Design a protein around this ligand. Structure first.
Ligand SMILES: CN(C)[C@H]1CC[C@H](Nc2ncnc3[nH]cc(C4CCOCC4)c23)CC1
Length: 279
């Protein structure tokens, strides 16, 4: 199904796991809580190699990736398990994550409103495919939305995905639904998290900022509803092509996604429908 790489092959293609960043001539692209991401080159093809630093998340990623293949899901090419180290090889996303592009990391120009609308639609198509295949992502966030050579949105990181209550609460607190913080596992929690992503797209602001008032982005929904502020006051100033009608239409979707009561949230098919009507 996927290519079985030996640890020595991934060792050489990543220039002996060169921990220096890409900008300084190394191979390190970044790091997460479960491992370091390296740029690799296998037979004239660029790859992303995640060296895990745990086995259940390796197995779950492979299991979900074998079952779910879609235009808006990142593709797994292979893996390595022969050593004491576990590696996952993916299709390389030249435009990194949506979080990095919204923050203009490493001098990248701001995303236009037109590109932002296409990204939101693509991400919704990806979540829709996961839910149609009875999978809950559990960690929907802008850092988990990757961008290819045409800025096509690709949902990533299926290590926490589930095919209901849990004793092990996992995810990113700033994006998590109230019931998800309580231990509930439901596809409606993915909808809430997508609502936070839509707010990041409109504002260009991260979900959480400790040196900001309010610290959490989902709290701007309260300020707008209580008439303290408007969505117009929060529109990313780094755009020149945003129109009030489509911004209000995306905000309306985000607002519906961010309902505290999980049953009042729209399903992903409705979210997909509202985002298509927006354009
Ligand atoms: C913090 N920031 C600079 C970045 C950290 C690296 C990250 N990863 C990717 N970048 C490019 N192509 C990729 N294909 C697959 C991946 C993911 C898939 C899930 O596991 C982790 C790697 C990937 C992009 C954002």
């Amino acid at each position: 199904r996927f290519h079985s790489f030996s640890f020595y092959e991934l060792k050489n293609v990543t220039n002996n796991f060169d921990e220096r960043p890409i900008s300084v001539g190394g191979n390190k692209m970044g790091e997460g809580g479960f491992g370091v991401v390296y740029k690799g080159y296998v037979n004239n093809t660029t790859v992303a190699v995640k060296k895990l630093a745990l086995k259940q998340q390796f197995d779950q990623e492979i299991k979900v990736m074998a079952k779910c293949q879609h235009e808006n899901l990142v593709e797994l090419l292979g893996f390595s398990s022969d050593g004491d180290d576990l590696c996952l090889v993916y299709v390389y996303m030249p435009n990194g994550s949506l979080l990095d592009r919204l923050s203009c990391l490493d001098g990248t120009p701001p995303l236009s409103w037109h590109m932002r609308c296409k990204i939101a639609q693509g991400a919704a198509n990806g979540i829709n495919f996961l839910h149609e295949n009875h999978h809950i992502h559990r960690d929907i966030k802008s850092a988990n939305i990757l961008l290819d050579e045409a800025f096509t949105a690709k949902i990533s990181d299926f290590g926490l995905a589930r095919a209901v209550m849990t004793s092990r609460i996992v995810g990113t607190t700033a994006y998590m639904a109230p019931e998800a913080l309580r231990g509930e596992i439901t596809p409606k929690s993915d909808i809430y998290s997508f609502g936070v992503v839509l707010l990041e797209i409109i504002t260009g602001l991260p979900a959480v900022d400790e040196h900001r008032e309010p610290q959490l982005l989902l709290d701007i929904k309260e300020e707008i509803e209580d008439e303290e502020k408007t969505i117009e006051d929060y529109i990313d100033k780094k755009m020149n092509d945003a129109d009030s009608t489509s911004v209000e239409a995306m905000y309306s979707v985000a607002s519906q996604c961010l309902h505290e009561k999980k049953n009042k949230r729209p399903d992903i098919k409705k979210v997909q429908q509202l985002l298509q009507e927006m354009t």
